[PDB]
């Protein structure tokens, strides 16, 4: 990046920093670049995690360039943009398209969980689409290790995005990482099927969250969602993380296994 790259436009922000669409001044190859003025501990950590990743539903990491204090992180550019931009406000998207994306989401989250990594900020802005509309989970700024040498560590830090965060994260000093990512996937599913988020945060003081706990599914967004995927959302958006559905049991759900698409 001495001046091999032209910064063409802003793609988005992660938890930490900004990512740009960079076009190479020599070959015109277009990539995404995250540019960070060196926290050194965090970016070091982000890089180490980014190097662990290799899966069809995780965004490709090309590498990094340290130049002065500033670190440059290079990634595959998602030619289909983000899932956020496929969700029509107040409508969502067609159910077969939502189910395919949800399958792919689950594949990527199983992969991360399997290498002991939790993402911590799953939401449509961070789920990217390639030229064939395959979903790729991006933005590892909040990702961390939850399992190492086969021993689980609990998480003890609040982070993410409020409409997507699980309730235990707001209430418990320490909590299990996997059920928090499961919960955010359910909020993504809700967005895809209804084009609207159900609550500002899953707290007792938020009426929309109380309404769900009281099973008022004749209200929006729930009323927009067919009974089969709603039944899955009933198992995912369970307040007590120990009673929440796990990914192996999502894979057995009726809707998850319903044939919808070519
Ligand atoms: C319309 C425009 C939208 N687009 C994109 C691409 C990307 C993107 N690619 N790779 C990334 C790697 C990391 C990344 O970290 C986020 C999710 C924090 C923004 C974004 C991208 N993020 C949004 N929009 C691609 C061009 C062709 O089309
Ligand atoms: Cl390990
Ligand atoms: Cl949305």
Curated annotation (Swiss-Prot):
Presence of the UniProt keyword Protein biosynthesis in the record: no
Lineage: Eukaryota, Metazoa, Chordata, Craniata, Vertebrata
Organism: Homo sapiens
Transmembrane spans: none
Substitution effect: residue 121 to A: Abolishes kinase activity
Subunit structure: Interacts (phosphorylated by ATR) with RAD51. Interacts with and phosphorylates CLSPN, an adapter protein that regulates the ATR-dependent phosphorylation of CHEK1. Interacts with BRCA1. Interacts with and phosphorylates CDC25A, CDC25B and CDC25C. Interacts with FBXO6, which regulates CHEK1. Interacts with PPM1D, which regulates CHEK1 through dephosphorylation. Interacts with TIMELESS; DNA damage-dependent. Interacts with FEM1B; activates CHEK1 in response to stress. Interacts with TLK1. Interacts with XPO1 and YWHAZ. Interacts with CDK5RAP3; antagonizes CHEK1.
Segments of this protein annotated with the region Interaction with CLSPN: 1-256
Result, substituting residue 123 to R: Strong reduction of chromatin-associated CHK1 ubiquitination
Enzymatic class: transferase
Cross-link (Glycyl lysine isopeptide (Lys-Gly) (interchain with G-Cter in ubiquitin)): 123
Domain Protein kinase stretches: 5-256
Tissue: Expressed ubiquitously with the most abundant expression in thymus, testis, small intestine and colon.
Coarse class of the protein's main subcellular location: nucleus
Cellular component terms per the entry's GO annotation: centrosome; chromatin; condensed nuclear chromosome; cytoplasm; cytosol; extracellular space; intracellular membrane-bounded organelle; nucleoplasm
Protein name, per record: Serine/threonine-protein kinase Chk1
Modification after translation, per record: Phosphorylated by ATR in a RAD17-dependent manner in response to ultraviolet irradiation and inhibition of DNA replication. Phosphorylated by ATM in response to ionizing irradiation.
Activity regulation note: Activated through phosphorylation predominantly by ATR but also by ATM in response to DNA damage or inhibition of DNA replication. Activation is modulated by several mediators including CLSPN, BRCA1 and FEM1B. Proteolytic cleavage at the C-terminus by SPRTN during normal DNA replication activates the protein kinase activity.
GO biological process terms, semicolon-separated: apoptotic process; apoptotic process involved in development; cellular response to mechanical stimulus; chromatin remodeling; DNA damage checkpoint signaling; DNA damage response; DNA repair; DNA replication
Binding of ATP, residues: 11-19, 34
Reaction(s) catalysed (UniProt annotation): L-seryl-[protein] + ATP = O-phospho-L-seryl-[protein] + ADP + H(+); L-threonyl-[protein] + ATP = O-phospho-L-threonyl-[protein] + ADP + H(+)
Locations listed in the record: Nucleus; Chromosome; Cytoplasm; Cytoplasm, Cytoskeleton, Microtubule organizing center, Centrosome
């Amino acid at each position: 990046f001495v001046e091999d790259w032209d910064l063409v436009q802003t793609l988005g922000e992660g938890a930490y920093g900004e990512v740009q669409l960079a076009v190479n001044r020599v070959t015109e190859e277009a990539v995404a670049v995250k540019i960070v003025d060196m926290c050194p501990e965090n970016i070091k950590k982000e890089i180490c995690i980014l190097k662990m990743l290799n899966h069809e539903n995780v965004i490709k990491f090309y590498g990094h360039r340290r130049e002065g204090n500033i670190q440059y992180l290079f990634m595959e550019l998602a030619s289909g943009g983000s899932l956020f931009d496929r969700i029509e406000p107040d409508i969502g998207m067609p159910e077969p398209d939502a189910q395919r994306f949800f399958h792919q989401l689950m594949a990527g989250v199983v992969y991360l969980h399997g290498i002991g990594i939790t993402h911590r900020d799953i939401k449509p802005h961070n789920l990217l689409l390639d030229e064939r509309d395959n979903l790729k989970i991006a933005d590892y700024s909040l990702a961390t290790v939850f399992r190492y040498n086969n021993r689980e560590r609990l998480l003890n830090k609040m982070c993410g995005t409020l409409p997507y965060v699980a309730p235990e994260l707001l209430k418990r000093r320490e909590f299990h990482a996997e059920p928090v990512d499961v919960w955010s996937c359910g909020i993504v599913l809700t967005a895809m099927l209804a084009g609207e988020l159900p609550w500002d945060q899953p707290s007792d003081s938020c009426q929309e969250y109380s309404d769900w706990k009281e099973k008022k599914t004749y209200l929006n967004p729930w009323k927009k969602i067919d009974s089969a995927p709603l039944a899955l959302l009933h198992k995912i958006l369970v307040e007590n993380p120990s009673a929440r559905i796990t990914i192996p049991d999502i894979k057995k759900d009726r809707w998850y296994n319903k044939p919808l698409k070519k």
